[PDB]
Amino acid sequence: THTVDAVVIGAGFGGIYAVHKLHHELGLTTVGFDKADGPGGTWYWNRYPGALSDTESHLYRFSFDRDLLQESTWKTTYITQPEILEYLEDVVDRFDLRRHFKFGTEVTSALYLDDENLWEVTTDHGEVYRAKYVVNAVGLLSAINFPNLPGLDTFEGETIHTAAWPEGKSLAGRRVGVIGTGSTGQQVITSLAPEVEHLTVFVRTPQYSVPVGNRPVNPEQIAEIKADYDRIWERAKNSAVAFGFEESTLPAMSVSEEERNRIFQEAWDHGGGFRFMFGTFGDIATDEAANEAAASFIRAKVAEIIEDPETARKLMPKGLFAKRPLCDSGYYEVYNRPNVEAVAIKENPIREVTAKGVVTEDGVLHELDVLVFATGFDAVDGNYRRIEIRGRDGLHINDHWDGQPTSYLGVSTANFPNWFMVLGPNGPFTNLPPSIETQVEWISDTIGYAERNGVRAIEPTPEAEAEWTETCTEIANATLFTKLFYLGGLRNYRAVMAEVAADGYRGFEVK
Ligand SMILES: Cc1cc2nc3c(=O)[nH]c(=O)nc-3n(C[C@H](O)[C@H](O)[C@H](O)COP(=O)(O)OP(=O)(O)OC[C@H]3O[C@@H](n4cnc5c(N)ncnc54)[C@H](O)[C@@H]3O)c2cc1C
Ligand SMILES: NC(=O)c1ccc[n+]([C@@H]2O[C@H](COP(=O)([O-])OP(=O)(O)OC[C@H]3O[C@@H](n4cnc5c(N)ncnc54)[C@H](OP(=O)(O)O)[C@@H]3O)[C@@H](O)[C@H]2O)c1
Ligand SMILES: O=C1CCCCCO1
Q1: What superfamily in CATH does domain 1-146+378-511 come from?
Q2: Which residues bind FAD (predicted)?
Q3: I need a surface site. Which of 52, 162, 165, 435 has the fewest CB within 10 A?
């Protein structure tokens, strides 16, 4: 039953930096915690085949330490999970942090003590920590999502969730079904297709995907990037999404059918999902006609790629190109293989799982040895809403988030003092690490200020939280995503966080 200045929940990008900042800049005694048996967070857990970043390799990392940027290396233009995981372990060892982290250790309640003005925090190892500050780096993701299919437990084969992939497991020569065609699904599908005896993909909503263009690089290309890194990060910190391309301000309809498609083809060829949505035109997300053009281009690629038309149509993405854009390493092409079958489960849904496989409503048994669920997770809400987290006067987090989850500035919420969030709700939608730094940096300032000036407790007003929900909402419904995040872009997000701090923490009850 110990007592410290600060607790950090989680050891991915966000939890790792927060420890570094709170211990080494602000001198605070600081303990880190993670269920996981080591660091990496998202990348400790997802070791499924083909797991790859959407963010180019040079930019999906910390920026804050200039020696590190010069010494780290990568193989391709996008970075794989082993390589990311490895990088976070180098980072963890480089800044001397293993020793602040209790691994294999779940934080299971967070009681705020109104009279001691402290947070009482308990582990599944029995321990208790009493801390003045809590920093939640629990991520945008929550519990694995895992639809309970009828008869599932009759299945005599192995079932695997993408995020619980057994290290070392091979599906080579097995008959495998995959459910889900999200970002994970496309990846695990491209990578499985060539090795398995047969692949059945259960598609519910086919999505829009552009080539990822993941190319090999030589040490000289890296060294041209290394030489220009102050400008790269300054540029990225001053863009909206920080994916490393200039963001277009050219309206789609402001140029010609041929020009429009010329631009859409160079982007296709160059590769990159965000690059397609935002590197090409500036209104794809905000003008109806801009959007339809982008979407149409992609469907023509799909009909150019899938030879058999009954298959093509099952994989044909429909309607607004207003989900997060995917990119792949040859996804549509997989459906030309004789040992891949597509099952459109809107038209022909799963009726049940039986001993030997999956049965659809048409009454065909799809014989499977392995059923892989690429069905994702259950939202930000989920990693908080699954705990004894209570704020002032014992108020429960799930009681406090009576409806949609909320925050002020993506890092805080009313009735939860000295309690912060890294990637809480209504935060930025960007290449995450640069946003994680913004958040951790602001959180570490705020906490340095609190100690230096003798602040007992800080928390936002419910007035302010609601003003933020409105700002996020007004900006959302100006885009085609409407038809959970602040969508004004990193640069605006940074000026806002900075103004609030320069303005004496406006929207915050300081005690
Ligand atoms: C396959 C995949 C690819 C991705 N690619 C990209 C990309 O290219 N670009 C991008 O910007 N984003 C990407 N993301 C999103 C990605 O999660 C973020 O970029 C980033 O990893 C977030 O890191 P984090 O430290 O904030 O949270 P996480 O890495 O999610 O770490 C959170 C940790 O909190 C822990 N935790 C939660 N509750 C508790 C508790 N009660 N006790 C102890 N521990 C707890 C979890 O175990 C977890 O390890 C991807 C995600 C996935 C799954
Ligand atoms: N950038 C990257 O390289 C990368 C890679 C992987 C993951 N990620 C991130 O991590 C998050 C998770 O991605 P993800 O692909 O694991 O999950 P996801 O985006 O949530 O994809 C979910 C998939 O499962 C399907 N699905 C869900 N429940 C189902 C059910 N009961 N029956 C049939 N199908 C079902 C969905 O279909 P519907 O859509 O019709 O519901 C969808 O195809 C994403 O937000 C993504 O940004 C990023
Ligand atoms: O591409 C991504 C994946 C996670 C969602 C926001 C970050 O950007």
Answers
A1: FAD/NAD(P)-binding domain (3.50.50.60)
A2: 14, 34, 42-43, 45, 54-55, 60, 107, 324, 432
A3: 165
